[PDB]
Amino acid sequence: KKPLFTKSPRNSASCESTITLQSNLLFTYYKHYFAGIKKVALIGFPDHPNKGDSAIYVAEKKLLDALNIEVVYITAQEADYSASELKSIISDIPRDEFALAFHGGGNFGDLYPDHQHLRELVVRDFPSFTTISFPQSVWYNEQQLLEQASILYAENPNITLVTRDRQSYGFAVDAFGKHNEVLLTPDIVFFMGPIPEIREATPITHDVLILARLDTLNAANLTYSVEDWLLWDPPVAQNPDSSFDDRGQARYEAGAEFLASARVVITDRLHAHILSTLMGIPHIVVENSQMGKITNYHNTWLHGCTLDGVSVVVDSVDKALSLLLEWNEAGYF
Amino acid sequence: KPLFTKSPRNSASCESTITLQSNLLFTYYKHYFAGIKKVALIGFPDHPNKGDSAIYVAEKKLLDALNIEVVYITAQEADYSASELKSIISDIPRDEFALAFHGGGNFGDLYPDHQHLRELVVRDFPSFTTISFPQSVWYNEQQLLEQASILYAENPNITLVTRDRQSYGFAVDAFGKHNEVLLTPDIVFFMGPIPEIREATPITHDVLILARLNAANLTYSVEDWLLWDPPVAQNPDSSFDDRGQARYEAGAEFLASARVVITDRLHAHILSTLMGIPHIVVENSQMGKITNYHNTWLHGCTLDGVSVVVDSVDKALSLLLEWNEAGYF
Ligand SMILES: [Zn+2]
């Protein structure tokens, strides 16, 4: 009953509506495109410390569970991929009940040839199945790399590409839109819905958390942490005998608790921004890169969460601190 | 009972696609019309184009489904009255009233009057929930784009809805700094499957060529659905609703008179899809008048017996014959 953002109740209603909209669109799109599917192989599981990519995995599980679809196989990298093992797993499954699902996020571009290569390997071993991605960021600065990657999608018109932001959508359409369906949906993590439970369960350890690149102790009676949520990793994730699911769950929960430790967050990471929004943690986001790592997504989907006490975007970390103080005297956290 | 009876398996795929588009329209507009009870429709198409009138009826249908009443309609500047609209909304709470821009292809170089009416209405009535029905949007001329951009920059509350990929990309680059821009299906898909009017209309010709070999035994008509107009639409004492309804129904019956349609019009293509009439679509222009929309939304209706796109009218005839011997119509 109570607002997601306590301390900014009227503005909270607008962002809660926006969360619900994104969650419904995800369901509506994926219910349709997974019609008839009962079992799925997940391709490109993020077996590495990035908290946002693991949160993407958990939200993918949640959506698949909501559609009564079972994950019967997972591959992270080429090294752990086995065509024989996957061939045997799907031998007993009717063709129209099985799909290939590409793990979403920012794994489609110049910097991610291994992720693309795994997609190529799996689709060519198992062609003519319902094949679709979870919502991706997509961009190639280099034509040569784009031309290479385009052959897979041209030769397999059944593959449906899902993008999560307007710039990725426009790029995907121009590059692959002749042969493949291209969609624009929200980021899958919004299917988790409001998750204030974890905000309330986690004890507050600092007043502010700075999850961004850089110091200045403006002593307005506020403690702060300048930690990075990359690098460090839950011990369970470091275990080789642990399952993919265990690693992804642990990394998601760890990342969520990490943000919950503060009353306000300053961040330049998209999924620190997304998760804080879902948990009802007030936060300022810093767009300090070119490209648009934050702003491409934000301007596509989150206009309704762009409010005082909820979430705001600024062009620098110094601007974030200034606004933080206004929020403090306003009592937004 | 399939929508496309002579292509039952392929019909299922296109019916799903219709349902998807209808649900997205509802989901988006339910959200963005939250709290709204009454609406003024701006840019009503008071002219013979059948597709634009079909857009109007679908707009009515959606508004009715959200329990929203249309309390005012303006087609052109000549019939617009600020005083009349001001008095109509005087007793309505601010947050219960919205301005709704009539959708379709009325946003670009060729449509300065449509844009001008939008400018007039928003500046007389600023700070209301303001949103468009799904539009096609493109400006070839920078000078015209720059002029039209001022309205949307000065009124950040306006939400722009586009109906295709290219329009969305254009709208985003041009207006995306200040305004929300959406990509939804074309509003006419909220009508859902309408085979009733296909079944009610008697077949007059075998083929209808609605665009710019004969025997083996196929009759054909090369009519244009512009120009001619139901007599009720020509009546000045008729209401906007009557004209729009009549023009929609007339356009629908016109397509229903054939067993197959060849067309180069987007809404002949859309309506034929909804009615379950097999048809071939011809993309004979440069702009992508058909293909921008089709490739955004209708991959699932791109099947034999349902609907196919080709680059010329000659190609359409060739495929028609394959469909005839297959028995797709
Ligand atoms: Zn004028």
Residue numbers in the entry:
A (entry chain A): 54 to 267, 283 to 401
B (entry chain B): 55 to 266, 285 to 401
Quote the study's own text:
The fission yeast pyruvyltransferase Pvg1p, which is localized to the Golgi membrane, attaches pyruvate moieties on oligosaccharides and consequently introduces negative charges on the cell surface. These cell surface negative charges play significant physiological roles, such as intercellular communication. We previously demonstrated that Pvg1p could specifically transfer a pyruvate group onto the α-linked galactose (α-Gal) residues of oligosaccharides. In the Golgi, Pvg1p relies on two transporters, Pet1p and Pet2p, for the supply of its substrate phosphoenolpyruvate (PEP), which is transported from the cytoplasm into the Golgi lumen.
In the present study, in order to elucidate the pyruvyl transfer mechanism of Pvg1p and also to understand the structural basis of its substrate specificity, we first determined the crystal structure of Pvg1p at a resolution of 2.46 Å. The purified Pvg1p was crystallized in the presence of Zn2+. Diffraction analysis of the crystal revealed a structure in which two Pvg1p molecules formed an asymmetric unit with two-fold axis (r.m.s. deviation for the 328 Cα atoms is 0.16 Å). Approximately 928 Å2 of the surface area was buried between the dimer, and it was stabilized by many hydrophobic and hydrogen-bond forming interactions between three α-helices and a β-sheet (α1, α6, α11 and β8). Because the predicted active sites were located far away from the dimer interface, the dimerization of Pvg1p seems to be not essential for the catalysis and substrate binding. The crystal structure of Pvg1p consisted of twelve α-helices and twelve β-sheets, and two α/β/α domains at the N- and C-terminal half regions. The folding pattern of Pvg1p resembled that of the type-B glycosyltransferase, including sialyltransferases. Charged surface representation analysis clearly showed a positively charged cleft situated between the N- and C-terminal halves of Pvg1p, which is suitable for the binding of negatively charged donor substrate PEP. In the proposed model, only the D106 residue is situated within hydrogen bond forming distance of the O6 oxygen of the galactose residue of Lac, whereas both R217 and R337 residues directly interact with PEP. Based on our predicted substrate-binding model of Pvg1p, less pyruvylation was probably due to the steric hindrance posed by the NAc group of the LacNAc-pNP with the H168 of Pvg1p, as a result of which it could not bind properly to the active site of Pvg1p.
